[PDB]
Amino acid sequence: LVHVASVEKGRSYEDFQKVYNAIALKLREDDEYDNYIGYGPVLVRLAWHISGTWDKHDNTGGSYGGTYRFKKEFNDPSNAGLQNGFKFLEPIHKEFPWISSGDLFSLGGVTAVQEMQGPKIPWRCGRVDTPEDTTPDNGRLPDADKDAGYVRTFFQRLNMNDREVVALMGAHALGKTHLKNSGYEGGGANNVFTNEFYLNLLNEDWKLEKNDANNEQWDSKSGYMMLPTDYSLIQDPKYLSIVKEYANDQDKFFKDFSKAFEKLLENGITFPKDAPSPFIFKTLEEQGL
Ligand code: HEM
Ligand SMILES: Nc1cccc2nccn12
Protein backbone atom coordinates (compact mmCIF):
# COMPACT_ATOMS: atom_id res chain seq x y z
CA LEU A 1 0.00 0.00 0.00
CA VAL A 2 1.62 3.28 -1.12
CA HIS A 3 -0.21 6.53 -0.29
CA VAL A 4 1.10 9.28 -2.39
CA ALA A 5 0.51 12.89 -1.23
CA SER A 6 -1.44 14.92 -3.81
CA VAL A 7 -1.78 18.67 -3.31
CA GLU A 8 -5.38 19.87 -3.34
CA LYS A 9 -5.71 21.22 -6.83
CA GLY A 10 -4.06 24.63 -7.28
CA ARG A 11 -3.70 25.25 -3.52
CA SER A 12 -0.62 26.80 -1.90
CA TYR A 13 0.58 28.04 1.49
CA GLU A 14 -1.80 30.97 1.61
CA ASP A 15 -4.83 28.63 1.19
CA PHE A 16 -3.74 26.54 4.16
CA GLN A 17 -2.86 29.63 6.25
CA LYS A 18 -6.48 30.70 5.73
CA VAL A 19 -7.70 27.34 7.01
CA TYR A 20 -5.26 27.57 9.95
CA ASN A 21 -6.63 31.03 10.65
CA ALA A 22 -10.22 29.92 10.62
CA ILE A 23 -9.49 27.11 13.07
CA ALA A 24 -7.44 29.53 15.26
CA LEU A 25 -10.19 32.15 15.26
CA LYS A 26 -12.81 29.53 16.24
CA LEU A 27 -10.46 28.33 19.01
CA ARG A 28 -10.46 31.86 20.38
CA GLU A 29 -14.24 32.30 19.88
CA ASP A 30 -15.58 29.02 21.30
CA ASP A 31 -13.81 29.45 24.59
CA GLU A 32 -16.42 27.95 26.94
CA TYR A 33 -15.96 24.36 25.88
CA ASP A 34 -15.03 21.87 28.64
CA ASN A 35 -15.11 24.32 31.56
CA TYR A 36 -13.19 27.00 29.63
CA ILE A 37 -10.40 24.69 28.49
CA GLY A 38 -11.51 25.39 24.95
CA TYR A 39 -11.03 23.05 22.01
CA GLY A 40 -7.19 23.09 21.81
CA PRO A 41 -6.54 19.87 23.71
CA VAL A 42 -9.27 17.80 22.02
CA LEU A 43 -8.02 18.89 18.60
CA VAL A 44 -4.50 17.73 19.45
CA ARG A 45 -5.89 14.41 20.63
CA LEU A 46 -7.95 14.10 17.47
CA ALA A 47 -4.91 14.62 15.27
CA TRP A 48 -3.02 11.98 17.24
CA HIS A 49 -5.89 9.46 17.16
CA ILE A 50 -6.36 9.77 13.43
CA SER A 51 -2.61 9.23 12.92
CA GLY A 52 -2.09 6.65 15.66
CA THR A 53 -3.99 3.87 13.84
CA TRP A 54 -0.95 3.51 11.52
CA ASP A 55 0.82 0.18 11.22
CA LYS A 56 4.36 0.34 9.82
CA HIS A 57 4.13 -3.34 8.80
CA ASP A 58 1.48 -2.99 6.09
CA ASN A 59 0.90 0.80 5.91
CA THR A 60 -2.67 0.50 7.01
CA GLY A 61 -4.31 3.25 9.09
CA GLY A 62 -2.63 6.58 9.49
CA SER A 63 -3.77 10.12 8.76
CA TYR A 64 -3.69 9.90 4.97
CA GLY A 65 -7.15 8.51 4.29
CA GLY A 66 -9.23 10.72 6.62
CA THR A 67 -11.01 7.56 7.69
CA TYR A 68 -12.17 8.96 11.08
CA ARG A 69 -15.12 10.36 9.13
CA PHE A 70 -16.49 6.80 8.82
CA LYS A 71 -18.61 5.29 11.56
CA LYS A 72 -16.36 2.32 12.41
CA GLU A 73 -13.54 4.70 13.37
CA PHE A 74 -15.73 7.57 14.59
CA ASN A 75 -17.29 5.06 17.03
CA ASP A 76 -14.07 3.42 18.25
CA PRO A 77 -14.37 3.35 22.03
CA SER A 78 -10.75 4.70 22.10
CA ASN A 79 -12.08 7.78 20.27
CA ALA A 80 -14.81 8.67 22.75
CA GLY A 81 -15.02 12.45 23.19
CA LEU A 82 -13.29 13.20 19.84
CA GLN A 83 -16.75 13.82 18.34
CA ASN A 84 -16.40 17.24 19.99
CA GLY A 85 -13.27 17.94 17.85
CA PHE A 86 -15.03 16.72 14.75
CA LYS A 87 -18.01 19.00 15.43
CA PHE A 88 -15.69 21.97 15.96
CA LEU A 89 -14.09 21.33 12.59
CA GLU A 90 -17.41 20.90 10.68
CA PRO A 91 -17.95 24.59 9.98
CA ILE A 92 -14.30 24.92 8.99
CA HIS A 93 -14.75 22.08 6.51
CA LYS A 94 -17.95 23.78 5.25
CA GLU A 95 -16.01 26.99 4.59
CA PHE A 96 -13.10 25.14 2.97
CA PRO A 97 -14.63 22.13 1.36
CA TRP A 98 -11.60 21.50 -0.88
CA ILE A 99 -9.37 20.38 2.01
CA SER A 100 -9.14 16.62 2.51
CA SER A 101 -10.35 15.15 5.80
CA GLY A 102 -6.87 13.97 6.81
CA ASP A 103 -5.36 17.32 6.04
CA LEU A 104 -8.07 19.04 8.09
CA PHE A 105 -7.82 16.77 11.10
CA SER A 106 -3.99 16.91 11.14
CA LEU A 107 -4.00 20.67 10.53
CA GLY A 108 -6.38 21.04 13.46
CA GLY A 109 -3.77 19.55 15.73
CA VAL A 110 -0.98 21.73 14.36
CA THR A 111 -3.11 24.84 14.77
CA ALA A 112 -4.09 23.91 18.32
CA VAL A 113 -0.48 23.28 19.43
CA GLN A 114 0.68 26.58 17.96
CA GLU A 115 -2.23 28.68 19.16
CA MET A 116 -1.66 27.25 22.64
CA GLN A 117 1.86 28.79 22.45
CA GLY A 118 3.54 25.51 21.61
CA PRO A 119 6.31 24.94 19.10
CA LYS A 120 5.85 25.55 15.40
CA ILE A 121 4.92 22.26 13.75
CA PRO A 122 5.84 22.07 10.06
CA TRP A 123 2.97 20.58 8.12
CA ARG A 124 2.59 19.15 4.64
CA CYS A 125 -0.64 18.93 2.65
CA GLY A 126 -1.78 16.24 0.28
CA ARG A 127 -3.57 13.56 2.29
CA VAL A 128 -6.29 12.09 0.07
CA ASP A 129 -9.62 10.76 1.32
CA THR A 130 -9.84 6.99 0.87
CA PRO A 131 -12.97 4.80 0.90
CA GLU A 132 -14.87 3.34 3.82
CA ASP A 133 -13.38 -0.10 3.37
CA THR A 134 -9.91 1.37 4.10
CA THR A 135 -10.96 2.32 7.64
CA PRO A 136 -8.81 0.52 10.14
CA ASP A 137 -10.50 -1.71 12.66
CA ASN A 138 -10.88 -0.57 16.26
CA GLY A 139 -8.20 -1.52 18.79
CA ARG A 140 -5.06 0.07 17.30
CA LEU A 141 -4.93 2.95 19.80
CA PRO A 142 -3.16 2.40 23.12
CA ASP A 143 -4.46 1.30 26.49
CA ALA A 144 -3.76 3.54 29.50
CA ASP A 145 -3.65 0.93 32.22
CA LYS A 146 -0.36 -0.59 31.24
CA ASP A 147 3.36 -0.23 31.99
CA ALA A 148 6.47 1.09 30.27
CA GLY A 149 7.16 -2.12 28.37
CA TYR A 150 3.69 -1.94 26.89
CA VAL A 151 4.14 1.70 25.90
CA ARG A 152 7.54 0.96 24.31
CA THR A 153 6.25 -2.01 22.32
CA PHE A 154 3.05 -0.22 21.37
CA PHE A 155 4.97 2.68 19.85
CA GLN A 156 7.31 0.50 17.79
CA ARG A 157 4.29 -0.09 15.57
CA LEU A 158 4.27 3.66 14.84
CA ASN A 159 8.07 3.65 14.32
CA MET A 160 8.65 5.73 17.40
CA ASN A 161 11.67 5.41 19.68
CA ASP A 162 12.02 6.23 23.38
CA ARG A 163 12.79 9.90 22.83
CA GLU A 164 9.83 10.23 20.43
CA VAL A 165 7.44 8.54 22.85
CA VAL A 166 8.51 10.66 25.79
CA ALA A 167 8.34 13.90 23.73
CA LEU A 168 4.89 13.03 22.34
CA MET A 169 3.50 12.24 25.82
CA GLY A 170 4.18 15.83 26.88
CA ALA A 171 0.88 16.64 25.25
CA HIS A 172 -0.63 15.10 28.42
CA ALA A 173 -0.09 18.47 30.10
CA LEU A 174 -3.07 19.59 28.02
CA GLY A 175 -6.77 19.44 28.88
CA LYS A 176 -8.00 16.62 31.06
CA THR A 177 -9.22 13.15 31.34
CA HIS A 178 -12.99 12.61 31.41
CA LEU A 179 -14.52 9.71 33.25
CA LYS A 180 -17.30 9.20 30.70
CA ASN A 181 -14.89 9.09 27.79
CA SER A 182 -12.04 6.92 29.00
CA GLY A 183 -12.66 5.79 32.58
CA TYR A 184 -10.10 8.28 33.93
CA GLU A 185 -10.81 11.62 35.52
CA GLY A 186 -9.07 14.87 36.10
CA GLY A 187 -5.92 16.77 35.46
CA GLY A 188 -7.23 20.31 35.62
CA ALA A 189 -7.84 22.82 32.82
CA ASN A 190 -4.56 23.66 31.10
CA ASN A 191 -4.61 25.06 27.55
CA VAL A 192 -1.08 26.38 27.37
CA PHE A 193 1.50 24.13 25.72
CA THR A 194 4.49 23.86 28.13
CA ASN A 195 6.84 21.20 29.46
CA GLU A 196 4.86 21.00 32.70
CA PHE A 197 3.97 17.28 32.18
CA TYR A 198 7.60 16.43 32.94
CA LEU A 199 7.91 18.87 35.82
CA ASN A 200 4.72 17.56 37.37
CA LEU A 201 5.82 13.95 36.99
CA LEU A 202 9.11 14.68 38.77
CA ASN A 203 7.95 17.17 41.39
CA GLU A 204 4.45 16.21 42.55
CA ASP A 205 3.58 13.85 45.40
CA TRP A 206 1.72 11.12 43.52
CA LYS A 207 -0.74 8.67 45.01
CA LEU A 208 -2.08 5.59 43.28
CA GLU A 209 -5.83 5.95 43.78
CA LYS A 210 -8.95 4.41 42.34
CA ASN A 211 -11.29 6.65 40.47
CA ASP A 212 -15.06 6.49 40.28
CA ALA A 213 -14.87 4.06 37.39
CA ASN A 214 -12.86 1.67 39.58
CA ASN A 215 -9.66 2.28 37.58
CA GLU A 216 -6.27 3.12 39.09
CA GLN A 217 -4.72 6.49 38.31
CA TRP A 218 -2.09 8.67 39.93
CA ASP A 219 -3.31 11.80 41.64
CA SER A 220 -1.68 14.66 43.50
CA LYS A 221 -3.28 16.97 46.07
CA SER A 222 -2.59 19.92 43.80
CA GLY A 223 -5.14 18.48 41.34
CA TYR A 224 -2.74 16.94 38.75
CA MET A 225 -3.28 13.42 37.49
CA MET A 226 -1.30 10.87 35.54
CA LEU A 227 -2.40 7.74 33.78
CA PRO A 228 -0.53 4.54 34.55
CA THR A 229 1.13 4.83 31.18
CA ASP A 230 2.21 8.38 32.01
CA TYR A 231 3.64 7.35 35.35
CA SER A 232 5.50 4.51 33.65
CA LEU A 233 7.78 7.15 32.12
CA ILE A 234 9.30 7.71 35.54
CA GLN A 235 9.32 3.98 36.43
CA ASP A 236 11.48 2.94 33.47
CA PRO A 237 15.04 4.20 33.68
CA LYS A 238 15.46 5.03 30.02
CA TYR A 239 12.24 7.01 29.92
CA LEU A 240 13.12 8.71 33.24
CA SER A 241 16.35 10.15 31.80
CA ILE A 242 14.38 11.72 28.99
CA VAL A 243 11.63 13.04 31.31
CA LYS A 244 14.38 14.79 33.31
CA GLU A 245 15.92 16.24 30.12
CA TYR A 246 12.64 17.78 29.05
CA ALA A 247 11.82 18.97 32.58
CA ASN A 248 15.08 20.92 32.44
CA ASP A 249 15.02 22.23 28.95
CA GLN A 250 11.79 23.75 27.56
CA ASP A 251 13.32 24.52 24.17
CA LYS A 252 14.61 21.01 23.71
CA PHE A 253 11.17 19.58 24.53
CA PHE A 254 9.58 21.97 22.01
CA LYS A 255 12.00 20.96 19.27
CA ASP A 256 11.69 17.23 19.89
CA PHE A 257 7.91 17.42 20.24
CA SER A 258 7.67 19.31 16.97
CA LYS A 259 9.69 16.67 15.12
CA ALA A 260 7.88 13.70 16.65
CA PHE A 261 4.47 15.22 16.09
CA GLU A 262 5.16 16.14 12.49
CA LYS A 263 6.40 12.59 11.99
CA LEU A 264 3.36 11.08 13.66
CA LEU A 265 1.04 13.09 11.40
CA GLU A 266 2.99 12.09 8.27
CA ASN A 267 3.55 8.36 8.95
CA GLY A 268 2.38 6.30 5.99
CA ILE A 269 2.58 9.13 3.45
CA THR A 270 4.89 9.15 0.45
CA PHE A 271 5.75 12.72 -0.53
CA PRO A 272 6.84 13.08 -4.17
CA LYS A 273 10.28 14.57 -4.63
CA ASP A 274 8.73 17.71 -6.13
CA ALA A 275 6.08 18.09 -3.36
CA PRO A 276 6.06 21.52 -1.69
CA SER A 277 8.29 21.92 1.34
CA PRO A 278 6.51 21.76 4.71
CA PHE A 279 4.58 24.82 5.58
CA ILE A 280 5.19 26.75 8.83
CA PHE A 281 2.05 28.65 9.65
CA LYS A 282 2.01 31.97 11.41
CA THR A 283 -0.03 32.21 14.56
CA LEU A 284 -2.92 34.75 14.81
CA GLU A 285 -0.67 36.62 17.24
CA GLU A 286 2.17 36.73 14.74
CA GLN A 287 -0.23 38.09 12.10
CA GLY A 288 -1.79 40.71 14.38
CA LEU A 289 -5.15 39.00 14.06
C1 HEM B 1 0.37 5.56 25.64
C2 HEM B 1 -0.11 6.50 24.85
C3 HEM B 1 -1.31 7.23 25.22
C4 HEM B 1 -2.38 6.84 26.05
C5 HEM B 1 -2.63 5.51 26.71
C6 HEM B 1 -3.23 8.00 26.08
C7 HEM B 1 -4.43 8.00 26.81
C8 HEM B 1 -5.25 9.15 26.97
C9 HEM B 1 -6.51 9.10 27.72
C10 HEM B 1 -7.13 7.93 28.42
C11 HEM B 1 -6.99 10.43 27.71
C12 HEM B 1 -8.27 10.98 28.29
C13 HEM B 1 -9.34 11.01 27.21
C14 HEM B 1 -10.64 11.55 27.83
O1 HEM B 1 -11.08 10.98 28.84
O2 HEM B 1 -11.22 12.54 27.32
C15 HEM B 1 -6.06 11.19 26.89
C16 HEM B 1 -6.21 12.60 26.68
C17 HEM B 1 -5.35 13.34 25.83
N1 HEM B 1 -4.35 12.77 25.13
FE1 HEM B 1 -3.53 10.93 25.25
N2 HEM B 1 -2.81 9.05 25.34
C18 HEM B 1 -1.62 8.64 24.88
C19 HEM B 1 -0.79 9.40 24.03
C20 HEM B 1 -1.02 10.68 23.55
C21 HEM B 1 -0.22 11.32 22.50
C22 HEM B 1 0.91 10.69 21.79
C23 HEM B 1 -0.84 12.61 22.35
C24 HEM B 1 -0.45 13.73 21.45
C25 HEM B 1 0.77 14.00 21.05
C26 HEM B 1 -1.97 12.63 23.28
C27 HEM B 1 -2.77 13.79 23.52
C28 HEM B 1 -3.85 13.82 24.45
C29 HEM B 1 -4.53 15.08 24.65
C30 HEM B 1 -4.18 16.42 24.07
C31 HEM B 1 -5.55 14.74 25.61
C32 HEM B 1 -6.59 15.66 26.23
C33 HEM B 1 -7.86 15.73 25.44
C34 HEM B 1 -8.92 16.55 26.14
O3 HEM B 1 -8.63 17.34 27.04
O4 HEM B 1 -10.10 16.51 25.69
N3 HEM B 1 -2.05 11.51 24.09
N4 HEM B 1 -4.95 10.46 26.49
N1 LIG C 1 -2.46 12.58 32.51
C1 LIG C 1 -3.19 13.09 31.44
C2 LIG C 1 -3.46 12.36 30.32
C3 LIG C 1 -4.17 12.94 29.31
C4 LIG C 1 -4.57 14.26 29.36
C5 LIG C 1 -4.28 14.97 30.54
N2 LIG C 1 -4.53 16.25 30.88
C6 LIG C 1 -4.11 16.45 32.12
C7 LIG C 1 -3.51 15.26 32.59
N3 LIG C 1 -3.62 14.38 31.54
From TrEMBL:
Residues 99-289 form the Plant heme peroxidase family profile domain. It is found in: Mitochondrion intermembrane space; Mitochondrion matrix. GO terms for cellular component: mitochondrial intermembrane space; mitochondrial matrix. Its EC number is 1.11.1.-. It is an enzyme of class 1 (oxidoreductase). Heme b binds at R45, W48, H172, K176, H178, N181, S182. One of its GO terms (biological process) is cellular response to oxidative stress. Keywords: Heme, Iron, Membrane, Metal-binding, Mitochondrion, Oxidoreductase, Peroxidase, Transit peptide, Transmembrane, Transmembrane helix. It catalyses: 2 Fe(II)-[cytochrome c] + H2O2 + 2 H(+) = 2 Fe(III)-[cytochrome c] + 2 H2O. GO terms for molecular function: cytochrome-c peroxidase activity; heme binding; metal ion binding. Signal peptide: none annotated. Forms a one-to-one complex with cytochrome c. Destroys radicals which are normally produced within the cells and which are toxic to biological systems. Belongs to the peroxidase family. Cytochrome c peroxidase subfamily. This is Peroxidase. It comes from Saccharomyces cerevisiae (strain RM11-1a). The chain holds residues 72 to 362 of 362 of the full protein.
